């Protein structure tokens, strides 16, 4: 039961040789639970403009658990996370990363990722991560 | 009843004078209806790391209608908007803009903004805008 960040899904879709891609392929093969935040779904759905490819990726993510953000609260927490990290000297590059982290902290799961933004959030907020560089 | 994008709120909060800033000041002074998407609220709350400033700005936005996104649907539409614009030759620079547009089109309001991204969305999807450059 963990959150798989956009960065890993992108790695999975981009090559078949990276650690991140291989890791996700293994997780998919084992029928393990993948939590898909709706904001991660959103980022993934813009990677190809063809509507049939988009529809196919939509069905890919539907295999897993698509989780909606907690209205207002996740967004407030995301901004709180960004401010805390910045006070700590780290400017997180995406508010979407912070929403994902806010959700993870809320439901108590780790985030699998290939994005140093999450290690920044780990440093200042404690977020559990599985880095896959 | 209209959505005010982050870009206009930033103009207002910034120390620089500008038409956008004067426009929002006027609208605030008139008690006109301002719609605040949660993602706009999120963006605005990271502009200053100071927690007391954040809290005060949280109360600023609370004066108006904080509008929640529609779970899953707004995110899907945001991505569809981004794909449609990209097929039309415009790469929208923020998925948050797309979420704001998705909400605007769903509830049927215009977006006041100082961000060409919404003019691209207007071209391809018909989004009503009030540009404030």
């Amino acid at each position: 039961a963990m959150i798989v960040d956009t960065s890993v899904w992108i790695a999975y879709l981009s090559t078949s040789e990276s650690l991140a891609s291989r890791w996700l392929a293994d997780r998919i093969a084992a029928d393990s639970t993948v939590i898909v935040p709706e904001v991660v779904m959103m980022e993934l759905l813009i990677g190809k403009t063809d509507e049939d490819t988009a529809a196919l990726r939509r069905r890919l993510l539907q295999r897993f658990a698509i989780e909606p953000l907690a209205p207002v609260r996740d967004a407030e927490d995301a901004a709180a996370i960004h401010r805390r990290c910045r006070r700590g000297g780290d400017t997180v590059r995406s508010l979407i990363d912070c929403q994902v982290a806010a959700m993870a902290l809320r439901i108590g799961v780790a985030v699998a990722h290939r994005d140093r933004d999450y290690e920044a959030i780990r440093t200042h907020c404690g977020l559990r991560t599985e880095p896959l560089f | 009843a209209m959505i005010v994008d982050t870009s206009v709120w930033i103009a207002y909060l910034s120390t620089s004078e500008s038409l956008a800033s004067r426009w929002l000041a006027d609208r605030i002074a008139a008690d006109s209806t301002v719609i605040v998407p949660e993602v706009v609220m999120m963006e605005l709350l990271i502009g200053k790391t100071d927690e007391d400033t954040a809290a005060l700005r949280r109360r600023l936005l609370q004066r108006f209608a904080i509008e929640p996104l529609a779970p899953v649907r707004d995110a899907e539409d945001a991505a569809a908007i981004h794909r449609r614009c990209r097929r039309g030759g415009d790469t929208v620079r923020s998925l948050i803009d797309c979420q704001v547009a998705a909400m605007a089109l769903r509830i049927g309001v215009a977006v006041a903004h100082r961000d060409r991204d919404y003019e691209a969305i207007r071209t391809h999807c018909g989004l009503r805008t009030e540009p404030l450059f």
């Binding site: 981009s14 998919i28 029928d31 980022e43 813009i46 196919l56 539907q62 | -």
Partner: peptide
């Protein structure tokens, strides 16, 4: 419209099927 969720083999078949942006690009267009 959301089609039927992919089966396991179907999902695995999408590995390497392509993405127009790096993660860096998707976070800063």
């Amino acid at each position: 419209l959301v089609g039927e969720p992919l089966g396991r083999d179907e999902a695995l078949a999408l590995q390497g099927s392509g993405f127009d942006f790096s993660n860096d690009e998707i976070e800063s267009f």
